[PDB]
Amino acid sequence: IRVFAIPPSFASIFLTKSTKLTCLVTDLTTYDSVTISWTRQNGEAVKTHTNISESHPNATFSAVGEASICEDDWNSGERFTCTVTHTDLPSPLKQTISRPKGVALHRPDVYLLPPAREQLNLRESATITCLVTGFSPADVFVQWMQRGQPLSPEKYVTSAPMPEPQAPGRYFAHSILTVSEEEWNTGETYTCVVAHEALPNRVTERTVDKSTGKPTLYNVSLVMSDTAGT
Amino acid sequence: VSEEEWNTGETYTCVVAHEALPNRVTERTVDKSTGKPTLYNVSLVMSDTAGTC
Amino acid sequence: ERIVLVDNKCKCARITSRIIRSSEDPNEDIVERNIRIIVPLNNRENISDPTSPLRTRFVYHLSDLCKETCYTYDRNKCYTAVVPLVYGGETKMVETALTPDACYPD
Amino acid sequence: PDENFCKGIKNVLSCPPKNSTGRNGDWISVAVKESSTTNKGVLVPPRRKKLCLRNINQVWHRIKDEKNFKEEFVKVALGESNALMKHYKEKNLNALTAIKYGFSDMGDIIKGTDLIDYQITKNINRALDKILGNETSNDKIKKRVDWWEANKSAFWDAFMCGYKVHIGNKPCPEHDNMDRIPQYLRWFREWGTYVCSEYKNKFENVIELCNVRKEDKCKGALKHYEEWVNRRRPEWKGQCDKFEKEKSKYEDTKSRTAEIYLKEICSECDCKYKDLD
Numbered sequence: 001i002r003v004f005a006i007p008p009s010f011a012s013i014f015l016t017k018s019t020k021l022t023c024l025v026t027d028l029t030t031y032d033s034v035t036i037s038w039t040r041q042n043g044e045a046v047k048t049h050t051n052i053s054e055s056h057p058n059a060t061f062s063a064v065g066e067a068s069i070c071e072d073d074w075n076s077g078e079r080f081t082c083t084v085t086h087t088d089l090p091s092p093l094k095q096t097i098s099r100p101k102g103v104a105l106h107r108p109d110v111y112l113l114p115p116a117r118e119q120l121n122l123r124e125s126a127t128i129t130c131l132v133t134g135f136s137p138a139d140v141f142v143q144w145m146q147r148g149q150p151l152s153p154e155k156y157v158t159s160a161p162m163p164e165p166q167a168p169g170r171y172f173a174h175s176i177l178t179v180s181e182e183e184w185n186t187g188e189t190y191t192c193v194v195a196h197e198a199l200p201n202r203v204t205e206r207t208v209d210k211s212t213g214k215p216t217l218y219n220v221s222l223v224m225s226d227t228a229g230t
Numbered sequence: 231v232s233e234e235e236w237n238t239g240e241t242y243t244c245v246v247a248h249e250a251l252p253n254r255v256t257e258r259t260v261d262k263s264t265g266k267p268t269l270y271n272v273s274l275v276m277s278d279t280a281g282t283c
Numbered sequence: 284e285r286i287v288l289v290d291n292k293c294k295c296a297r298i299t300s301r302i303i304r305s306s307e308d309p310n311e312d313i314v315e316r317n318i319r320i321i322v323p324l325n326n327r328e329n330i331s332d333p334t335s336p337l338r339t340r341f342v343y344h345l346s347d348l349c350k351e352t353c354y355t356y357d358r359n360k361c362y363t364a365v366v367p368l369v370y371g372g373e374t375k376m377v378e379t380a381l382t383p384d385a386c387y388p389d
Numbered sequence: 390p391d392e393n394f395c396k397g398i399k400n401v402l403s404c405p406p407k408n409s410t411g412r413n414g415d416w417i418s419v420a421v422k423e424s425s426t427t428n429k430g431v432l433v434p435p436r437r438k439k440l441c442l443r444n445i446n447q448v449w450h451r452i453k454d455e456k457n458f459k460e461e462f463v464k465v466a467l468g469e470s471n472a473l474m475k476h477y478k479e480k481n482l483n484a485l486t487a488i489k490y491g492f493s494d495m496g497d498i499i500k501g502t503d504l505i506d507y508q509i510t511k512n513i514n515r516a517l518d519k520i521l522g523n524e525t526s527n528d529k530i531k532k533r534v535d536w537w538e539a540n541k542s543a544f545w546d547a548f549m550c551g552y553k554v555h556i557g558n559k560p561c562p563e564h565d566n567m568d569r570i571p572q573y574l575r576w577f578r579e580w581g582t583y584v585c586s587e588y589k590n591k592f593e594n595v596i597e598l599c600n601v602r603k604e605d606k607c608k609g610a611l612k613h614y615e616e617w618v619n620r621r622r623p624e625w626k627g628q629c630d631k632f633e634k635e636k637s638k639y640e641d642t643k644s645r646t647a648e649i650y651l652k653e654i655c656s657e658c659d660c661k662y663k664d665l666d
């Protein structure tokens with residue numbers, strides 16, 4: 001019997017424009033008696049869950065949660081809980097979930113690090129790290145794109161947010177995109193997008209390629225004409 | 231004009247009127263500030279901090 | 284003491300002329316143009332499009348800038364673009380802030 | 390007389406502007422410390438992070454005498470005086486506090502007791518140790534303290550040389566002898582002065598908006614105030630915890646709460662303290 005409640009990240013708040021709470025119950029026996037309504041701070045509820053699957057890859061029960069809470073309620077930080085009606089548990093389990101109140105809001109800084117020259121000498125794969133510094137709280141959303149169209153989620157892997165080594169309340173996020181070396185040598189522009197609540201426009205973008213990220217040479221054609229002027 | 235007068239800046243503005251002209255006035259200007267200069271120092275810095283000019 | 288004739292921001296040129304005052308003599312005093320033009324050296328050809336390659340050839344027509352995709356960003360104006368974002372099957376296009384301190388909410 | 394004697398001008402290298410960074414510095418971001426366990430919750434100012442030691446970094450190895458050791462710190466003190474006042478000339482604020490804080494920070498770097506993990510600080514410490522002679526750790530620390538206490542006069546006179554190249558006719562201020570105050574208390578005072586000025590500004594705004602007029606702009610003002618207090622609370626918690634740990638070792642700090650220590654002496658507006666109680 002495994003149960004988890006996942007807060008909606010700021011990407012779910014921004015991109016989907018809807019706050020969806022999920023309290024998933026997985027790896028247990030199937031009884032099909034799930035009827036969960038997300039309780040607000042008071043006794044009333046907002047909406048029931050949808051799309052419960054009575055099958056699992058390991059032949060168990062997999063449950064999900066679904067609701068639609070107004071964003072102003074999340075800005076208020078009211079405590080929400082998920083209570084189970086499904087019959088395997090003799091007593092319902094409560095998972096109190098809410099947005100933390102009192103946390104700081106530092107704008108993240110998106111930083112791109114080109115692959116090392118030692119790795120590029122191997123000529124098989126090139127790894128680029130999208131290093132994010134100084135965001136609070138931990139919930140950060142990061143995407144990788146090539147020349148404007150997005151990549152598959154399997155191509156790039158991002159690490160879980162971790163506390164800053166020296167800063168008191170800041171956090172850092174580290175994401176890597178693994179691509180072939182010949183693609184990096186062709187000069188394709190590789191860009192990173194980070195979504196966070198403390199950003200000015202909520203989305204800031206940085207671009208790196210062979211010519212930008214630690215280039216071997218600076219090629220510049222410094223042409224000028226009509227120095228007489230008018 | 232006196233040669234001493236031209237040395238100081240008076241901007242010596244030239245004004246004309248003609249039929250086939252949009253504003254009926256074309257304003258032209260010569261002074262000592264504008265002209266063929268004796269010295270040219272074109273100074274470029276190969277700056278890396280961009281987007282701040 | 285120098286008159287700034289033309290100060291274009293994208294080309295970041297500074298067309299200004301100065302006159303060195305000579306001693307008590309007939310006039311051979313030196314007229315100069317104090318032009319000080321700054322290169323970004325790392326910006327891309329399409330300044331609005333982040334996905335452009337590096338620009339190497341910088342063409343500075345001095346007569347043209349007195350009175351054409353432009354070179355360096357200006358902190359007063361915004362150079363912004365739209366980037367796709369995906370949370371799943373859906374695709375949403377969101378405007379992004381390419382440079383800070385220019386489009387900051389004020 | 391309460392001025393300084395005519396001091397010869399020495400060559401000084403340029404330093405990057407303090408306002409060049411668009412973020413204008415970050416109090417919360419701390420880079421390196423001696424230890425964050427025994428010294429926990431102490432915040433480095435942007436001024437300390439932007440402390441320009443370019444002059445001594447060039448000749449920290451070629452130097453062989455104490456006369457040049459005094460002269461070189463005069464050269465960098467003049468550069469700091471030019472840099473700090475020019476930054477505050479645009480800000481239109483008194484730079485005396487920044488001047489004396491920078492002097493005290495430089496002196497603590499001379500001591501080697503500055504709350505920083507710079508190898509530059511270690512290099513200057515080794516250079517000063519080889520200047521005066523090598524002894525045991527406590528002995529060389531005490532000798533360096535005595536040397537700086539003896540030779541701070543020229544450094545401080547150079548600081549008011551940079552001060553009086555602008556202020557001119559008005560009398561020079563007094564030393565105030567806060568060199569016995571360590572690094573962390575001075576950083577506490579700087580943080581308190583800065584955060585009190587910002588609380589003055591934000592409280593003036595929130596009053597002028599909400600008290601007269603619930604307008605949406607007033608709600609935004611309250612949200613900005615909430616964001617700033619949420620940002621600044623952990624800083625206060627860490628600094629107050631540090632004050633509580635190093636509480637008992639001086640007489641001036643024998644006053645129990647840290648906020649009244651900030652209030653009762655200097656460098657504060659007597660407005661807000663951010664107590665959790």
Ligand SMILES: *[C@@H]1O[C@H](CO)[C@@H](O[C@@H]2O[C@H](CO)[C@@H](O)[C@H](O)[C@H]2NC(C)=O)[C@H](O)[C@H]1NC(C)=O
Binds near residue numbers: 329331332352
């Ligand atoms: C490259 O520069 C061109 C200008 O020569 C721009 O292309 C158009 O710019 C206008 C004004 O910003 C937009 O409304 C159009 O949507 C742009 N065209 C396209 C096809 O998007 C733009 O600055 C750059 N082009 C791109 C594609 O970013």
Ligand SMILES: *[C@@H]1O[C@H](CO)[C@@H](O)[C@H](O)[C@H]1NC(C)=O
Binds near residue numbers: 220
């Ligand atoms: C370098 O610049 C010159 C002149 O613009 C050009 O002819 C040459 O092809 C460039 N080389 C590379 C590798 O970009």
Ligand SMILES: *[C@@H]1O[C@H](CO)[C@@H](O)[C@H](O)[C@H]1NC(C)=O
Binds near residue numbers: 318
């Ligand atoms: C051009 O020369 C004048 C003196 O002739 C000098 O004052 C000025 O600074 C020079 N321009 C630059 C960019 O250095």
